[PDB]
């Protein structure tokens, strides 16, 4: 609420990564269950905003959850009033009009998009982005690996490789989670079996 003499107003969370491609957008999140008693299935670090928009977050703190509810209400009221699903950039503007966020989704206006909120609340469209303490190491790999012809199949293994590189524990279908949005299927979360077979594909690549 006060500017500094330099004109500005007066990172430790879990990592989330996402890639955007001509075929789809893939998101991934570190789960990091704090105890074997904790219900790993109850760690929803990725949530749906609309049937073609999902959000990956460093942590679903209640301040994040209120923003999720506001974004969901914005999407639903846009459908109610316009009889059309909200465009991704319009949804990001509405949320901005209202934590590290990867708003990502699909629409027929700009295709496949991924958005990250900079600390000043200004959303930037990204080809690939990472957040959390892992972003510092992840960004170089993302700059190295992304190419315009990247396939969704390759993007899944890319995000999984980033998770393997930064995570504190050997990848499995439980300690890490993936999700993707596609024009035909919409926003969906990879089940434990699909995550598992992708992890075995990663291991086969390593082998």
């Amino acid at each position: 609420s006060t500017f500094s003499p330099e004109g500005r107003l007066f990172k430790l969370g879990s990592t989330a990564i996402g890639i955007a491609t001509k075929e789809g957008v893939v998101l991934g999140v570190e789960k990091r269950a704090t105890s074997p008693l904790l219900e790993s299935d109850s760690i929803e670090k990725i949530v749906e905003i609309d049937r073609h928009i999902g959000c990956a977050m460093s942590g679903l703190t209640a301040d994040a959850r209120s923003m999720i509810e506001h974004a969901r209400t914005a999407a639903v009221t846009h459908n109610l009033y316009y009889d059309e699903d909200i465009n991704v950039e319009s949804l990001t503007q509405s949320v901005c009009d209202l934590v590290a966020l990867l708003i990502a989704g699909h629409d027929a206006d700009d295709g496949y998009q991924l958005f990250h909120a900079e600390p000043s609340g200004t959303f930037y469209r990204y080809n690939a982005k990472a957040i959390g303490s892992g972003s510092e190491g992840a960004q170089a790999e993302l700059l190295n690996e992304w190419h315009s012809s990247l396939t969704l199949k390759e993007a899944e293994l890319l995000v999984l490789k980033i998770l393997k590189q930064v995570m504190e524990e050997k990848l499995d279908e439980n300690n890490a989670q993936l999700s993707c949005i596609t024009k035909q299927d919409g926003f969906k979360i990879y089940d434990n079996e699909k995550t598992a077979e992708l992890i075995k594909e990663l291991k086969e690549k390593e082998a």
Binding site: P36, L37, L38, D41, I43
Partner: peptide
């Protein structure tokens, strides 16, 4: 207090929650 909630199979809260949670991890 953060507003964070999560499902647990067994959990403890209070002053000595750490010891009881450690005890649970080796018994559940």
């Amino acid at each position: 207090p953060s507003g964070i909630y999560s499902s647990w199979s067994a959990q403890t809260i209070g002053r000595n929650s750490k010891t009881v949670r450690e005890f649970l991890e080796k018994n559940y």
